[PDB]
Amino acid sequence: MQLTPFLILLRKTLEQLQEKDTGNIFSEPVPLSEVPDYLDHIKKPMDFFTMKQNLEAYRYLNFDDFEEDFNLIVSNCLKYNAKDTIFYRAAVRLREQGGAVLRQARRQAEKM
Ligand SMILES: O=C1CNc2cc(Br)ccc2N1
């Protein structure tokens, strides 16, 4: 496949995913000022802005690795936060809704 169409597809998929983050709690790195003990539990932080940066740095050359970092956004949040928190439920919703976005984008990818 050709790189340029693939990357415009990842750009579109990334904005579709970011759209699901209505609370805007995944679109920027978790502020270590608000959450000082965060990197004590979270080995690799991830967020949609970082993903965009990674995309443009050509770090995503297949959907698996793109999807890998999205999954980090979700799993980091499930790991750090108690089940009874808004944050945890947000991550579950993102897993669900983002999963559907990803399945479709992958389908368009398979077409390529
Ligand atoms: O796990 C998280 C996801 N994002 C976030 C943003 C702020 Br602001 C504060 C805490 C978190 N924790």
Swiss-Prot record:
Protein purpose: Scaffold subunit of various histone acetyltransferase (HAT) complexes, such as the MOZ/MORF and HBO1 complexes, which have a histone H3 acetyltransferase activity. Plays a key role in HBO1 complex by directing KAT7/HBO1 specificity towards histone H3 'Lys-14' acetylation (H3K14ac). Some HAT complexes preferentially mediate histone H3 'Lys-23' (H3K23ac) acetylation. Positively regulates the transcription of RUNX1 and RUNX2.
Annotated ranges, domain Bromo: 1-105
Tissue specificity of this protein: High levels in testis.
Native source organism of the sequence: Homo sapiens
Entry comment on modification after translation: Acetylated by KAT6A.
Residues of the full protein shown: 628 to 739 of 1214
The protein, known as: Peregrin
Subcellular compartments: Nucleus; Chromosome; Cytoplasm
Complex and partners: Component of some HBO1 complex composed of KAT7/HBO1, MEAF6, ING5, and BRPF1. Component of the MOZ/MORF complex composed at least of ING5, KAT6A, KAT6B, MEAF6 and one of BRPF1, BRD1/BRPF2 and BRPF3. Interacts (via PHD-type zinc finger domains) with unmethylated histone H3 at 'Lys-4' (H3K4me0). Interacts with trimethylated 'Lys-36' of histone H3 (H3K36me3). Interacts with ING5; interaction directs BRPF1 to H4K4me3-enriched chromatin at the 5' of active genes. Interacts with KAT7.
Disease: Intellectual developmental disorder with dysmorphic facies and ptosis: An autosomal dominant neurodevelopmental disorder characterized by delayed psychomotor development, intellectual disability, delayed language, and facial dysmorphisms, most notably ptosis. Additional features may include poor growth, hypotonia, and seizures.
Signal peptide: none
